[PDB]
Amino acid sequence: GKAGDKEWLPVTKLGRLVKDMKIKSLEEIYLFSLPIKESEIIDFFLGAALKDKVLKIMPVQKQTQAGQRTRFKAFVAIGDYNGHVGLGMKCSKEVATAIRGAIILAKLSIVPVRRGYWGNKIGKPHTVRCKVTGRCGSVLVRLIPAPRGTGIISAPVPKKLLLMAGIDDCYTSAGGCTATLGNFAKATFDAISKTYSYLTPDLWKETVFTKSPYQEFTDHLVKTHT
Amino acid sequence: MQSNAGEFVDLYVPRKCSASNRIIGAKDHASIPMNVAEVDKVTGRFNGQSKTYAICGAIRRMGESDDSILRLAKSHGIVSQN
Amino acid sequence: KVHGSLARVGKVRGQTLKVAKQEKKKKRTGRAKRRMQYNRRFVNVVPTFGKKKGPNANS
Amino acid sequence: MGKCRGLRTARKLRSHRRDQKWHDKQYKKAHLGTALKANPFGGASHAKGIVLEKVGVEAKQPNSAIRKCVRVQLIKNGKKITAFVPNDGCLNFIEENDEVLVAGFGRKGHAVGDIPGVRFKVVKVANVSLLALYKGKKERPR
Amino acid sequence: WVCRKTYVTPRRPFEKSRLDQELKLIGEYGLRNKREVWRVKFTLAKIRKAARELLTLDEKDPRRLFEGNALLRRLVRIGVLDEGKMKLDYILGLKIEDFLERRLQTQVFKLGLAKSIHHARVLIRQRHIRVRKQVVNIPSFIVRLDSQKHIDFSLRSPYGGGRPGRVKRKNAKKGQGGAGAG
RNA sequence: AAAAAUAACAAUACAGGACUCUUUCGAGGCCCUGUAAUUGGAAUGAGUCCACUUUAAAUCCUUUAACGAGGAUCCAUUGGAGGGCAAGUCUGGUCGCAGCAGCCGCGGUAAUUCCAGCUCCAAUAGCGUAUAUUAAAGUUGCUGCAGUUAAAAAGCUCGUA
RNA sequence: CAGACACCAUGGUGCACCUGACUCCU
């Protein structure tokens, strides 16, 4: 018999507006393009379906004056299957410390990915709207959208990553080094945050340049500091 | 980014800029609005609503944002001596 | 190098021996074997119990 | 990269691609016929041959054990080759002049394991299926 | 003269998540082996791509229409697809198990003398049923709409009506020699 | 190459998952599925077999009177468990031996690499090997390679094709 | 920043090892 607890603490203007039901979703901050230093803000908003994936706990080491010194380089990714994925890397002396560290680093680093259609125009997005790509040490991970029923045709490392996006229909073609798998996923993480980065003609309709809910709530933000 | 006529696919609409015609994305740092107060019209005692202007880090890291809001606050008003 | 003299053939096989294990119930074949493999692994009791195993793991 | 590109350069890249393709190790020796020439397979899938001698090979380091190969001259090929003997306790099934069905082992042109120069194995010792001999499914009639 | 394979082989040999996923469809529908999984897996990859190519064709093409409206009808005459949707976008959304339900086996398990899908494959294989005026012995039969309206006892199944072979007689011999003491 | 068998099916019981009762326990409670003793009707050709059939004659096929399953059956295999690579941090032996191991590799005694047992996995009337070739391979790069330092700008320049 | 500077060879071997859960029931 053993149980865990949670206590909220705001360290910023956001986490007060998080806890006071003024900011209700990451989608606001995703529109607001603001930093987040509290992974519990994410846990305040979703707290569910955010699949933790311990990719590789690889033992890396440095030689010292007395023999060597090693550490566990754990690769823990987060994501719900909805258009939001994350990743954490924790280099700890233990495994589970490097796991549970990179769990929370995955939690804090969850990002939105922009899903779309292949040649479709309706049907609640199933792939990307655009061929996206990314490199991490010469390993180019290019993604190509597919129509429905095709599947995620990938190496097994981006196949889980495209799964966590909800991009269920994608083609791959990768060149580079064949063994460095952490550089595979880090190059793959470049392509999926690139989905918002491509300017669609649907994205030519520009916005009203929202007005910094620091300032919009700065009187409500008066708790001990505005 | 929307789908079929009334149906919206994207999770949100990311912000933009007027200085590089370029979007402000998801968690982009030094990617900020610029709220400049409407000060009123010799009667004085500034009128509320600040004029907003979204600035990305790209025009910031290229050091463009000084003339950019000068192309946004002088050009659109209101500012004395202009 | 150049050497070509054999020393021991079946040295470990002459000291490691075998038996057989008879079917109390048969090795079912083809159809009802592969049918049995799904239903035995899940619905006997329906799986509610346990973690951290393979089907042969002393692990 | 680095190339000419125009509207008459189909004549160029027809010459340019193949002549660079000749630099490939896999493209050259396979199209020199040397794999047929230096090795008895390449022109065969299985090839039957007479056992020249049984060679009890102490392995060059690493993997300290004794390999215990066999040396074969093929019939279609006539090449005096040495094939590795798998199957613990079944070098005993081999004699000399013990006609065997030989095959390439796993490398199709170079040495395997801890042992240099041996790239072949025997499928059928005495042409009576050493696999079935090691399984006990056959006995050696010779 | 001409033959072909009706099953398929993936390029990954051991993908255990898939290998136990294929164990599901056998246990969920009563299949022989993974070949019965791979048989419909052989078909459905071609079905989606045929749906894909006709979708990428220009409209009002007879090779898109007259072939496709056949392919619309051929998928609806068997009742796997319904033609209330009837476009290439939804044909990209079909699956294996839509065909497996339209097999003869599950419809025997859905309708008739099958207690199990072990049992449902047996009633076809041991020919207790007639789907028409037809002793039908193939469990992978995949049926049509009218086909689900004439599945009966066979007249070679002596139980439920039929000429005796040697088995209800043996089951009579279970009471006339199994109980008749000779 | 095609179809796809070597038996289901309940009953029984347990082992429970909802469930209902119960403060829960526990009981009731099926879906059951393994396993039990079994089977119980219920089957089926795999057969055998009159017969009709078949075709040049046949032949097989299908048609079949009739027979042909409660069990260890009418009784599937071929490959793998050191990783890659699924499934033995099994059990025994062996002790860098014997062997294994495409590759990365075990074995030098408390062998997860042997050799076996057992268990498991894998496909399956096939499965495995050999060799061959196609992809994977953007390691021939037309799409679409790389050429400072990993392979790769000629010693430099004119200069024709 | 700005005083004086010689030869000196060799040498060798195993273990850095791939996941999560908290019904101690107090």
Short mmCIF file of N, CA, C and O in Angstrom, two decimals, chain C residues 35-57:
data_model
loop_
_atom_site.label_atom_id
_atom_site.label_comp_id
_atom_site.label_asym_id
_atom_site.label_seq_id
_atom_site.Cartn_x
_atom_site.Cartn_y
_atom_site.Cartn_z
N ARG C 35 -6.78 -22.37 -33.94
CA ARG C 35 -7.96 -21.88 -33.24
C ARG C 35 -7.77 -21.91 -31.73
O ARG C 35 -8.27 -21.02 -31.02
N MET C 36 -7.09 -22.93 -31.23
CA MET C 36 -6.91 -23.06 -29.78
C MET C 36 -5.95 -22.00 -29.26
O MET C 36 -6.07 -21.56 -28.11
N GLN C 37 -5.01 -21.55 -30.10
CA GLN C 37 -3.94 -20.67 -29.65
C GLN C 37 -4.47 -19.29 -29.27
O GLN C 37 -3.92 -18.64 -28.38
N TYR C 38 -5.52 -18.82 -29.93
CA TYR C 38 -6.09 -17.55 -29.52
C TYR C 38 -6.90 -17.69 -28.23
O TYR C 38 -6.70 -16.92 -27.28
N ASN C 39 -7.80 -18.66 -28.19
CA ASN C 39 -8.81 -18.71 -27.14
C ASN C 39 -8.21 -19.13 -25.81
O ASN C 39 -8.68 -18.71 -24.75
N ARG C 40 -7.18 -19.98 -25.85
CA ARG C 40 -6.48 -20.37 -24.64
C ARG C 40 -5.69 -19.21 -24.05
O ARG C 40 -5.64 -19.04 -22.83
N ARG C 41 -5.06 -18.40 -24.91
CA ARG C 41 -4.23 -17.30 -24.41
C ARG C 41 -5.06 -16.19 -23.80
O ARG C 41 -4.55 -15.41 -22.98
N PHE C 42 -6.33 -16.07 -24.19
CA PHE C 42 -7.15 -15.00 -23.64
C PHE C 42 -8.32 -15.50 -22.80
O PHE C 42 -8.29 -15.37 -21.58
N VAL C 43 -9.29 -16.18 -23.40
CA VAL C 43 -10.59 -16.35 -22.75
C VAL C 43 -10.61 -17.73 -22.09
O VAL C 43 -10.86 -18.73 -22.74
N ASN C 44 -10.27 -17.79 -20.80
CA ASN C 44 -10.47 -19.05 -20.10
C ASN C 44 -11.32 -19.06 -18.82
O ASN C 44 -12.39 -19.66 -18.83
N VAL C 45 -10.95 -18.37 -17.73
CA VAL C 45 -10.81 -16.93 -17.44
C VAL C 45 -10.22 -15.92 -18.42
O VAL C 45 -9.12 -16.07 -18.93
N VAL C 46 -11.03 -14.88 -18.65
CA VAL C 46 -10.65 -13.65 -19.35
C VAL C 46 -9.53 -12.96 -18.58
O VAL C 46 -9.58 -12.91 -17.34
N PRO C 47 -8.47 -12.46 -19.24
CA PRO C 47 -7.28 -12.02 -18.49
C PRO C 47 -7.53 -10.76 -17.67
O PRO C 47 -7.84 -9.69 -18.21
N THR C 48 -7.41 -10.91 -16.36
CA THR C 48 -7.62 -9.83 -15.40
C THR C 48 -6.38 -9.79 -14.51
O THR C 48 -6.10 -8.78 -13.85
N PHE C 49 -5.60 -10.87 -14.55
CA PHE C 49 -4.54 -11.11 -13.59
C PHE C 49 -3.18 -11.08 -14.28
O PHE C 49 -3.03 -11.59 -15.40
N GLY C 50 -2.18 -10.50 -13.61
CA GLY C 50 -0.79 -10.72 -13.95
C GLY C 50 -0.09 -9.71 -14.84
O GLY C 50 -0.74 -8.89 -15.50
N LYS C 51 1.24 -9.79 -14.87
CA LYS C 51 2.12 -8.91 -15.65
C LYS C 51 3.52 -9.52 -15.67
O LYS C 51 3.82 -10.43 -14.90
N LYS C 52 4.35 -8.98 -16.57
CA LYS C 52 5.78 -9.31 -16.70
C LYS C 52 6.04 -10.81 -16.93
O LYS C 52 6.63 -11.50 -16.11
N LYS C 53 5.58 -11.30 -18.08
CA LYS C 53 5.92 -12.67 -18.44
C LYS C 53 5.95 -12.85 -19.95
O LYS C 53 5.37 -12.06 -20.70
N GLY C 54 6.68 -13.88 -20.38
CA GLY C 54 6.45 -14.51 -21.65
C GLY C 54 5.81 -15.85 -21.39
O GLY C 54 5.73 -16.30 -20.24
N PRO C 55 5.35 -16.54 -22.43
CA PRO C 55 4.70 -17.85 -22.24
C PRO C 55 5.64 -18.97 -21.83
O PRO C 55 5.16 -20.08 -21.56
N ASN C 56 6.95 -18.72 -21.78
CA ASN C 56 7.91 -19.72 -21.30
C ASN C 56 8.84 -19.10 -20.26
O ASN C 56 9.76 -19.77 -19.78
N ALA C 57 8.63 -17.84 -19.89
CA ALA C 57 9.58 -17.12 -19.08
C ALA C 57 9.55 -17.58 -17.63
O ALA C 57 8.52 -17.47 -16.95
#
